[PDB]
Amino acid sequence: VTTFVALYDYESRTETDLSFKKGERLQIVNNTEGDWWLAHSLSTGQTGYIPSNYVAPSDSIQAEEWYFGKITRRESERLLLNAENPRGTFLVRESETTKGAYCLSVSDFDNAKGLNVKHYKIRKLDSGGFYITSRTQFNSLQQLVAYYSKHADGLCHRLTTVCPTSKPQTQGLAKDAWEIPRESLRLEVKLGQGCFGEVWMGTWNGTTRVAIKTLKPGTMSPEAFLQEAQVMKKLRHEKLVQLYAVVSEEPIYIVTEYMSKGSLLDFLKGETGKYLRLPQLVDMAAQIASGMAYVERMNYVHRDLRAANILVGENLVCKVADFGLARLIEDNEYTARQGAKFPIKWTAPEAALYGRFTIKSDVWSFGILLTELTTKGRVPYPGMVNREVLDQVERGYRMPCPPECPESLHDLMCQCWRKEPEERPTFEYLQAFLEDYFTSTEPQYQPGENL
Ligand SMILES: CC(=O)N(C1CC1)[C@@H](C(=O)NC1CCCC1)c1ccc(F)cc1
């Protein structure tokens, strides 16, 4: 039994889980594994299961507000570059490139680069202490942060503000919540309409904001959906919209992680996508590619990858939604890859012609998606009707490089559009290509030699 501290507030939805406020002290066992831990709160004397990502052991670095653990270099920059953060906003993370070194990431402002993030490798001493520059050593990470909060002393700027963040999603709505009753869900605001149902913002069990998709009766077999949903339930990645729960009887409701900024396609159009710069668009493509690289690793298939099925959150977070759902659609026309509801302009020819949906036809759809990303959301094949597209694509026509899409990205698109699926790149490749698309000379980490 270790004492853990609550990193965030958590409102107890159910009977068996535990409500707690941040800073509460909770007793939890030695080895316990999984997403939900049994806890006893010393602070309240109350008992119940807790989401394990909401706690850390007392008096660890993981309990420190400014410690973001395994966050990626690119993702730390996403959070730190929020325009509301003052200069000197910071976090500490593990180094991606150097053993059990840590890294201090700090927001800054420059007359050359503007708003930018500087990264300082924090190395550990034989003593167990830490240092950024060997001339100034500390016994602990906390002492290090305290010192550079008072004096830049070589750093680009004094540490001012702990990087802010939203409470993380829990994994599942509760321990053992999966098939839920319609009554647990309050549909609050209808957000959109599709061919086969609607999308809602809602609340589960009076506590938790969720998205709810409602399907038109007869869209899918409830039994088939349930069987697939067991498979989708296992797909867990920061760039995949989480599938929380399902109401299995007609009409089917699908309960999902709520994404505050709506679909990428809508986002690209209108009063916010007009301003996006290429590095932001490439970072959004890189997030999407990372989610699809997980799908690829898991030997799954999206089947309808396009901007309308990417959802946007705070700070240009992008997540893949509705993976695998298209396969269950019971509509004679759609299943034929035919009709006004089939996204033929995103569909690889072998998927259109022979129904061969694979990760490589998703790769083709990603190439089309890159086209939406670089045109503020214009429909692909602009002057072509859905009826012509397949034959043109089979004959070898490919969209030209959109205006103000760099040629190197269009060459990436053309790779995604090879006729032969096995000659299209992997999402693994796409993610690395897009993550490394912009480079510099040697500035990765600030030379902490002598500040
Ligand atoms: C025409 C159309 O809107 N769709 C199908 C062509 C693909 C949408 C659709 O009907 N969504 C429903 C309506 C609101 C949410 C649920 C769609 C998107 C991804 C999928 F995995 C499955 C269906």
Shared domain check, 407 and 389:
yes
- C-alpha 371/C-alpha 377 separation (Å) is 8
Beta pairing, strands 161-162 & 89-94: parallel
Shared domain check, 113 and 42:
no
Q: Does 177 reside within a domain?
A: no
Residues 6+ away with beta carbon under 8 Å from 262? 191, 192, 311, 312
Shared domain check, 428 and 296:
yes
Shared domain check, 424 and 278:
yes
Shared domain check, 430 and 296:
yes
- C-alpha 329/C-alpha 411 separation (Å) is 33
Amino acid at site 316:
L
Task: Ligand 1 pocket test: pick from 254, 322, 365 the residue with the most ligand atoms within 8 Å of its Cβ.
Answer: 322
The enclosing domain of 188 has a CATH number of: 3.30.200.20
Residues 6+ away with beta carbon under 8 Å from 274? 376
Distances (CA, A) of 92 to 63, 204, 446: 12, 34, 15
Distances (CA, A) of 140 to 81, 102, 123, 125: 27, 12, 11, 10
Q: Does 174 reside within a domain?
A: no
- C-alpha 269/C-alpha 286 separation (Å) is 20
Q: How far is the CA of 128 from the centre of ligand 1 (A)?
A: 54
What does the CA dihedral 307, 312, 317, 319 come to, rounded to 10 degrees? -60
Backbone angles phi, psi at 40, to 5 degrees: -125, 120
- C-alpha 65/C-alpha 83 separation (Å) is 20
Sheet strands side by side (includes 130-131): 137-138, 130-131, 114-124, 102-110, 89-94, 161-162
- C-alpha 359/C-alpha 350 separation (Å) is 12
Residues 6+ away with beta carbon under 8 Å from 447? none
Query: How many angstroms from the chain centroid is the CA of residue 24?
Result: 28
Q: Please list the active-site residues.
A: 304
296 annotated among ligand-binding-site residues: no
Please state the domain count of the chain: 4
Burial of 310 (0-12, 13-18, 19+ CB in 10 A): buried
Atom 11 of ligand 1, nearest CA residue: 194
C-alpha radius of gyration, the chain, whole number: 24
Tell which residue, 71, 441, 78, has the closest CA to residue 282.
78
- C-alpha 63/C-alpha 54 separation (Å) is 10
Burial of 275 (0-12, 13-18, 19+ CB in 10 A): exposed
Given the structure tokens 């709506």, which residue do they identify?
A: 262
Burial of 390 (0-12, 13-18, 19+ CB in 10 A): middle
Given the structure tokens 């799954």, which residue do they identify?
A: 300
Task: Ligand 1 pocket test: pick from 190, 193, 195, 342 the residue with the most ligand atoms within 8 Å of its Cβ.
Answer: 195
Q: Six-digit token pair at 161?
A: 């503000």
Q: Does 172 reside within a domain?
A: no
Q: Does 417 reside within a domain?
A: yes
Tell which residue, 435, 367, 374, has the closest CA to residue 404.
374
- C-alpha 363/C-alpha 292 separation (Å) is 9
The enclosing domain of 151 has a CATH number of: 3.30.505.10
Domain boundary among 38, 61, 84: 61
- C-alpha 36/C-alpha 147 separation (Å) is 37
Helices 427-435 and 278-297: crossing angle in degrees, nearest 10, is: 150
Atom 9 of ligand 1, nearest CA residue: 194
Q: Does 268 reside within a domain?
A: yes
Residues 6+ away with beta carbon under 8 Å from 114? none
433 annotated among ligand-binding-site residues: no
Tell which residue, 330, 309, 331, 304, has the closest CA to residue 320.
309
Shared domain check, 415 and 268:
yes
Q: Are 425 and 415 in contact (CB under 8 A)?
A: yes
- C-alpha 180/C-alpha 204 separation (Å) is 10
Reported resolution in A?
1.9
> How many Cβ atoms sit within 10 Å of the Cβ of residue 227?
11
373 annotated among ligand-binding-site residues: no
Tell which residue, 122, 96, 93, 91, has the closest CA to residue 106.
91
Q: Dihedral sign for Cα 96, 100, 101, 102, please.
A: positive
The enclosing domain of 330 has a CATH number of: 1.10.510.10
Shared domain check, 232 and 371:
no
Tell which residue, 227, 201, 280, 216, has the closest CA to residue 250.
216
Given the structure tokens 């299961």, which residue do they identify?
A: 49
**Is 199 near ligand 1, meaning CB less than 6 Å away?**
yes
Domain, as residue range, for 363: 264-435
Shared domain check, 225 and 360:
no
- C-alpha 164/C-alpha 65 separation (Å) is 9
Beta pairing, strands 197-204 & 208-215: antiparallel
Residues in the chain: 451
Shared domain check, 356 and 374:
yes
Q: Dihedral sign for Cα 32, 34, 40, 43, please.
A: positive
Q: Six-digit token pair at 159?
A: 């540490």
Shared domain check, 334 and 285:
yes
Domain boundary among 162, 195, 226: 162
Beta pairing, strands 25-28 & 253-256: unpaired
> How many Cβ atoms sit within 10 Å of the Cβ of residue 436?
9
Q: Does 171 reside within a domain?
A: no
225 annotated among ligand-binding-site residues: no
Q: Six-digit token pair at 234?
A: 């296992």
Amino acid at site 391:
D
Shared domain check, 402 and 322:
yes
Tell which residue, 354, 362, 347, has the closest CA to residue 426.
362
User: For the chain, what is the HEC assignment?
Assistant: CEEEEECCCECCCCCCECCECCCCEEEECCCCCCCEEEEEECCCCCEEEEEHHHEEECCCHHHCCCECCCCCHHHHHHHHCCCCCCCCEEEEEECCCCCCCEEEEEEEEECCCEEEEEEEEEEECCCCCEECCCCCEECCHHHHHHHHHHCCCCCCCCCCEECCCCCCCCCCCCCCCCECCHHHEEEEEEEEEECCEEEEEEEECCCEEEEEEEECCCCCCHHHHHHHHHHHHCCCCCCECCEEEEECCCCCEEEECCCCCCEHHHHHCCCCHHHCCHHHHHHHHHHHHHHHHHHHHCCCCCCCCCHHHEEECHHHCEEECCCCHHHHCCCHHHHCCCCCCCCHHHCCHHHHHHCCCCHHHHHHHHHHHHHHHCCCCCCCCCCCCHHHHHHHHHCCCCCCCCCCCCHHHHHHHHHHCCCCHHHCCCHHHHHHHHHCCCCCCCCCCCCCCCC
**Is 322 near ligand 1, meaning CB less than 6 Å away?**
yes
What does the CA dihedral 175, 180, 182, 183 come to, rounded to 10 degrees? -40
Task: Tell me the β-bridge partners of 201.
Answer: 189, 211
- C-alpha 155/C-alpha 317 separation (Å) is 29
Backbone angles phi, psi at 198, to 5 degrees: -140, 165
Shared domain check, 374 and 309:
yes
